[PDB]
Ligand binder design. Sequence first.
Ligand SMILES: [Ca+2]
Length: 342
Amino acid sequence: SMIVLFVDFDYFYAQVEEVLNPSLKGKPVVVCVFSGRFEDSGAVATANYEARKFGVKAGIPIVEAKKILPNAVYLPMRKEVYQQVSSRIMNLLREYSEKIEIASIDEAYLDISDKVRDYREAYNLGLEIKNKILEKEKITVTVGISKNKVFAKIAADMAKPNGIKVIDDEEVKRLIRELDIADVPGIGNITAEKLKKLGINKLVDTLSIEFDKLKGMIGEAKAKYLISLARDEYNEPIRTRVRKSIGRIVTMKRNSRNLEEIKPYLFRAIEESYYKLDKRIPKAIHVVAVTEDLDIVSRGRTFPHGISKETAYSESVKLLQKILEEDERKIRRIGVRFSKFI
DNA sequence: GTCCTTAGCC
DNA sequence: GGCTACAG
Ligand SMILES: [Ca+2]
């Protein structure tokens, strides 16, 4: 009882550039966010399987990427192109079950309990999903099928890319015992290391250790949740994610601490955040500053009414002003985030 | 329900 | 780098 079907687009951004650009078949492809500063200032957002065999990965500096593969194909992120392709697949997804939780620009969880009898009909539903998506958008996905959200995700990780994998109630048990902890959704590097010292290498170890000695560390929320996976008791429903804050953040030319030159960046993040809102009026604004050393500093302000675009303008300067005088360091990035919509 | 600094994700 | 939620 309770069948969750999970869908993750493989090397999404790079795959979309491949479908668009037949001249990139075969070779390696590295989609980057270019800073606008120096030559190859920036970071990597994704790489195809061919790029990833060589270490080139999401998050490393572009400069480093080019140390490894000086001649992969390097491409600027075109966020709104993957956004179009993404919403088109999300809609195809939406036809198979009303109960859909969109989790990022490239993964979605389907609850299929009323639409199939057991896993055998699911895995088939899985194949239909895949093929229909590849037909209409020429994009390969991976399908994960399990008893809850988290093991749906894990199942897709084991069969990525282009593929499909079921994890029945039994295999849940093996993975509770013998699967590596960092491979648990919502657990990457920093929290592996938070436990890598601690003696915990698999989910089970968490039951073999005191509760507060975990609570205190990675934090109560994270401790509870993992313990729930250990006990095989996770049962979080599939609900429509609602976007809580929409924002923009842009890197400046020559990072500085003069308000009059910082000002025009600040205002562009505002236009584009309004752009985004889309008929949504927030009550809250935060001015976000990234410093010369890269130590994020944020000041906001909540209003009992919604914030007009113009009030967003003047109000931002006041919050910018506050930062300029409580943190001492120069400013490299500047932005705004809007939240608590009407 | 409010000011703020903290990790997993493409 | 840019995004967004999450942690008390
Ligand atoms: Ca994903």
